[PDB]
Amino acid sequence: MSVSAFNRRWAAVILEALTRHGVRHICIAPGSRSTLLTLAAAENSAFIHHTHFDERGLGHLALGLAKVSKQPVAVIVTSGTAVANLYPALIEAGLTGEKLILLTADRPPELIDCGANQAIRQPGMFASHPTHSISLPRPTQDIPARWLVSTIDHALGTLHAGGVHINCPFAEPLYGEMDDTGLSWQQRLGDWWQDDKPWLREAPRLESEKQRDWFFWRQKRGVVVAGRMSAEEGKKVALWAQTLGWPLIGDVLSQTGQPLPCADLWLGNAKATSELQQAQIVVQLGSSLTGKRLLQWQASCEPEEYWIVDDIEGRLDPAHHRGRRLIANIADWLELHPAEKRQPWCVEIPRLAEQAMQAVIARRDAFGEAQLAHRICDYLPEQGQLFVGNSLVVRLIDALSQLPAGYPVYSNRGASGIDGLLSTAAGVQRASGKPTLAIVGDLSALYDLNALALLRQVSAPLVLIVVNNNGYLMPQNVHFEHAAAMFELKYHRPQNWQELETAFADAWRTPTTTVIEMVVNDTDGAQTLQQLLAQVSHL
Amino acid sequence: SVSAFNRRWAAVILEALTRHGVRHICIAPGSRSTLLTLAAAENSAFIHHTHFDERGLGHLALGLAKVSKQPVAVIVTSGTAVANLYPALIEAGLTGEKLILLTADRPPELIDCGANQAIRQPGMFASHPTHSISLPRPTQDIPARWLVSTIDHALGTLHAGGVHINCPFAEPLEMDDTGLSWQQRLGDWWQDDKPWLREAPRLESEKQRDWFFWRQKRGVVVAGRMSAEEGKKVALWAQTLGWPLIGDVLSQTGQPLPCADLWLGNAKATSELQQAQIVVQLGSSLTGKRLLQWQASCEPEEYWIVDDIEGRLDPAHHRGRRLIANIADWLELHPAEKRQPWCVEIPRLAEQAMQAVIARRDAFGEAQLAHRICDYLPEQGQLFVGNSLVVRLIDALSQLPAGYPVYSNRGASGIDGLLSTAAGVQRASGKPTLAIVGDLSALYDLNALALLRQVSAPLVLIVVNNNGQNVHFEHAAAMFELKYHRPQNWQELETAFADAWRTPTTTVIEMVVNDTDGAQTLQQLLAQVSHL
Ligand SMILES: O=C(O)CCC(=O)C(=O)O
Ligand SMILES: O=C(O)CCC(=O)C(=O)O
Ligand SMILES: [Cl-]
Ligand SMILES: [Cl-]
Ligand SMILES: [Mg+2]
Ligand SMILES: [Mg+2]
Ligand code: NA
Ligand code: NA
Ligand code: NA
Ligand code: NA
Ligand code: NA
Ligand code: NA
Ligand code: NA
Ligand code: NA
Ligand code: NA
Ligand code: NA
Ligand code: NA
Ligand code: NA
Ligand code: NA
Ligand code: NA
Ligand code: NA
Ligand code: NA
Ligand code: NA
Ligand code: NA
Ligand code: NA
Ligand code: NA
Ligand code: NA
Ligand code: NA
Ligand code: NA
Ligand code: NA
Ligand code: NA
Ligand code: NA
Ligand code: NA
Ligand code: NA
Ligand code: NA
Ligand code: NA
Ligand code: NA
Ligand code: NA
Ligand code: NA
Ligand code: NA
Ligand code: NA
Ligand code: NA
Ligand code: NA
């Protein structure tokens, strides 16, 4: 008899199944036609719950949680444009491999395309961006609970990386009658209910094989380029390159400690370019390289072979070198392709690197963007993590700073959207519980302004540094003092290093967010970068 | 010079669009869109609007299109910028605004190889735009007449909804003469005022040959969203036929049988309606709970929906007719003939309904604000309503004047872009504007207070706060240098307004209420009115 009693049990089966695939965190924007999913989510003790009222920011919240935990993270939303607001964070996940399980409630098929409310076409809404899309059928008991959990297990089990869109229509009414309808339908799953594992286990691994000619290649003149990877991988890559005797170019996202710092500067030197032309093979581990000089060099170098090792699939070399694209966990890969001690073949590079760091240091003082970027590793929280936006300021950290090996760095450098940086940082901080430094420009802060609601609720101190270069009535110069106030966050606008170091100490005390607004020019940082680059090009 | 030719290809795209009434252009600053952007700046045909949030940029453009009834272009750079446009594109696809999305793209060699800010853009919006064009990589080997014809075809044939034109450009982005002669192949089209190719079919239903029979039956007229002029014409027409007119808040009909959401819960009213043999619905997106239940359950011999949107609009799937037409043209094609009012109990029920509500107009609550709203309407202005309890309340408790413009985002009723849509609504027409929103809506689109800063006539944003949080908007107002008031009674409210109408600025009025009085008061009026 009861359609709502049945709808609840369909929904509970879908949630129970996610539970068998590592889904722990779940993000929900409340709204009264996803009711069944939200409701099955609350009954389910397995989930840690997060909410936000802006579905765009909710996607990014989920994206941040996945990015740090390396587990799949679910998102439930109600039917209509709620769903479309998930696209950005979905897109970013498809590039960087976050597993976002989007459960989008939908009207039933009889209510689509007929003037009904909050009703749009949701199946295939995200085109090729999900790794898998499941458009679930209208709930009925005539489809066995084993089909339903098997379809979900198929999608999650085969999922190497990226998001999955599960569209979930529900018959109206979403409320009412409250009986045993669909009770024996659930009971056919038997003791899968007290189990632990998927109903259907489908989990093939996608992995490249051991390169049998590694023992030759490892004795040639190689270079290691280290892109985005985990904190732990960065230290491993640092050891492996050092053992090989190969120059390591490490990105801000690599956490290698950057043994050859200020690459963005020293790749400008003709002495450095000439040593590198002698390179017979380049082994690039990780991807999304940050620096202009590194991107130019990569694009123009001509080693016999060019290798990209990364756990994401597809082509990762925008200059299309002849070589290899190797799919792997970077740490397993280094295991499979171990180093033997060999004397370094580079003689000039390690000098130029030192000299470049000395040049930046002769410049540490003017209270600006480039200098904050240079000194950033002085303000990093102890046992913390850094989240870094899509701004000049982070190319400047990459160019002018030397971050410590193994210190966690996170970002959104898939498509480098500037639309979700605060909600992302909020997910990054929640997943790990660590105190967090997030560095962002003013447009990114204005873009995701309402994620300040999210940042109120951090589990450790979070410092949001907003680098502000600004950025009918005369245009105004916006600031973030009232924004902070509006959300009961701490706020500082330091004028000098003493005030910044002070602002940082007060910030690192309680668990909430302190906004530190650093007003700067729209030219000093760029300008300082160029000066150091010419200086180094000459050295 | 690749660069010099890329500017000229972009040039041709933009000039094409001007021959189709595109006057407004909304732009979000971005490095990879520079060519469409520069081209746009150099073309005098356009009025330019900027926003930093692409989602709110889409909704601005939607607000512009909603009032202007002309196509509005949007330009964004490659990447998730593009995806931020989906919400407004989807809305347009339902209410019929013509948003022309020009999405800059990396050239095809740079897709799917880990390049920066590079994503799969063609087909990205799935079935939602009315037409989608994935333009080829620019080259002078494809002649300019192809490019303009492709555009003239997308826009000439556009009945309603959006158009996605993906525009890849090769890099670098050396002011040569490189594609000059390529452009000059268009000869004097460049000095012309029309499209290159004119393809402009009309989509429209034929005259209903049996109207003279049906216009004498016992009909009910239901009026949803339509233009202000049409609101007045439908009122005249319904009156002439002797048929009751259930006029939505979006109808601008003057609601001659006000408080339908109450009197529809009375058996004397429904029983009289049961005698209805035809329902003519003009427009759609009906607002009221009672009206939506009534609509779903009614059982005339035929149900008609007249609207210029295409596709089914009756979610009860009644037997009858779906008629595509400009409402105004349709009335002319199907004239009323003067005829005696077949209804007796309803006009009295409506009156006692209003009377019942006037009786409880004093408490300083959501419901009373809603009932008294026409005391605060700006003269010769326009109202913009959110998707919020407070606007159900206006529809239930108020009677808005015939022919006063009302606008809304009520296709998919997202709460995601109401401020930025409001800002486009004010700019399209230049009128002073009232916009009514809930706290959650205002939070959702908070950064669009930056658009509301820049208005050509006063705008008042009533934010109706029943906060579940416990946030306020004084600091948001202060962040963007907007005037702010939190009135605590009717005198403080009336005063906030007098101030508000003097200068071309936005003032934020925050009404703080309860999460229950509003629902309660409506529930008690329903019961009361159902007992008459
Ligand atoms: O990249 C930059 O120059 C800073 C841009 C920025 O202004 C922002 O994202 O707020
Ligand atoms: O504030 C209202 O009028 C009710 C709707 C609502 O809660 C909101 O959109 O914030
Ligand atoms: Cl993940
Ligand atoms: Cl081509
Ligand atoms: Mg900036
Ligand atoms: Mg509210
Ligand atoms: Na789990
Ligand atoms: Na929605
Ligand atoms: Na699939
Ligand atoms: Na489906
Ligand atoms: Na079963
Ligand atoms: Na599985
Ligand atoms: Na039962
Ligand atoms: Na292999
Ligand atoms: Na091999
Ligand atoms: Na690092
Ligand atoms: Na590090
Ligand atoms: Na040299
Ligand atoms: Na590759
Ligand atoms: Na391979
Ligand atoms: Na850099
Ligand atoms: Na940023
Ligand atoms: Na925002
Ligand atoms: Na946002
Ligand atoms: Na843009
Ligand atoms: Na409309
Ligand atoms: Na339009
Ligand atoms: Na598309
Ligand atoms: Na092509
Ligand atoms: Na070509
Ligand atoms: Na050719
Ligand atoms: Na033609
Ligand atoms: Na193109
Ligand atoms: Na044209
Ligand atoms: Na033709
Ligand atoms: Na009415
Ligand atoms: Na009426
Ligand atoms: Na209602
Ligand atoms: Na209803
Ligand atoms: Na119809
Ligand atoms: Na609202
Ligand atoms: Na409207
Ligand atoms: Na609407």
Coordinates of C-alpha atoms and ligand atoms in Angstrom, one line a residue, chain B residues 288-290 292-293, ligand 39:
Chain B
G288 CA -0.5 29.0 -4.6
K289 CA -0.8 25.6 -2.8
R290 CA -4.7 25.7 -3.2
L292 CA -2.1 23.9 -7.5
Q293 CA -4.2 21.3 -5.7
Ligands
NA39 NA 0.3 21.9 -4.1

